[PDB]
Design a protein around this ligand. Sequence first.
Ligand SMILES: C[C@@H]1[C@H](O)C=C(C#CC2=CCC[C@@]3(C)[C@@H]2CC[C@@H]3[C@H](C)CCCC(C)(C)O)C[C@H]1O
Length: 253
Amino acid sequence: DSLRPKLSEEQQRIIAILLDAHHKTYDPTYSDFCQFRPPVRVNDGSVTLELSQLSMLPHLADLVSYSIQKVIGFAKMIPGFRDLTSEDQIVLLKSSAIEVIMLRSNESFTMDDMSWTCGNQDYKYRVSDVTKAGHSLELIEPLIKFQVGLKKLNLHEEEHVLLMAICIVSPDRPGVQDAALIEAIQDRLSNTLQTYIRCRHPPPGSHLLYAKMIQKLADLRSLNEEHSKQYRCLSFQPECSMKLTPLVLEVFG
Ligand SMILES: C[C@@H]1[C@H](O)C=C(C#CC2=CCC[C@@]3(C)[C@@H]2CC[C@@H]3[C@H](C)CCCC(C)(C)O)C[C@H]1O
């Protein structure tokens, strides 16, 4: 009884652009990782030791800064993002940066051992590594829950890039000027996503995937708020900005 409208020429183009944007901004071999400040793993088996050392912070801060640069690159290739004022472009990028990083990290996340595997042994990131970077389990546990839940959706790469774009272009972000434009750009992306699922995703017996995808966006909202709280506490540690990057400092500070 549910209508299945075909993907329009513009919608097929939008997907093509977004897939191409992602392949230009996501290296699945993670060959740049060795250029970061080296990962250090001291035995913790302690929140006092954690903040004392912050051993994994320089590496992960470089990982996040690098990721932010890629997201910016990805955003500029999103259809519509061009038409926005640069002031609205920054607003959207700053408030969605950590959300989109959590999204795009799912391509490296594996349910083999519940880790982010970016090769090879050194660049395998477990729960203990994130703690060693000065974050508590209040963020880390729900983050893994999110990643696992997202993995089980078995998203097509077409859906994965669309979801990242919808995430970035959000009219309900604190500080937006032209919310109607952002809403129009998001509607264009959402409609393409809704059409694609009904068209391309099998069987389809339960097209209830879209509602599950919108739920993931809300999961990101609360994760964003929790990371924000924990970042503020990390920044209280003396000589902490040293371990971060000017870009990470601007986005979260
Ligand atoms: C490069 C690809 C993608 O961009 C993200 C990846 C990742 C990852 C991550 C692996 C371990 C946890 C993270 C460090 C990131 C993603 C978000 C996590 C935390 C909460 C961010 C903390 C930031 C700060 C220390 C400044 O507070 C791997 C690849 O899939």
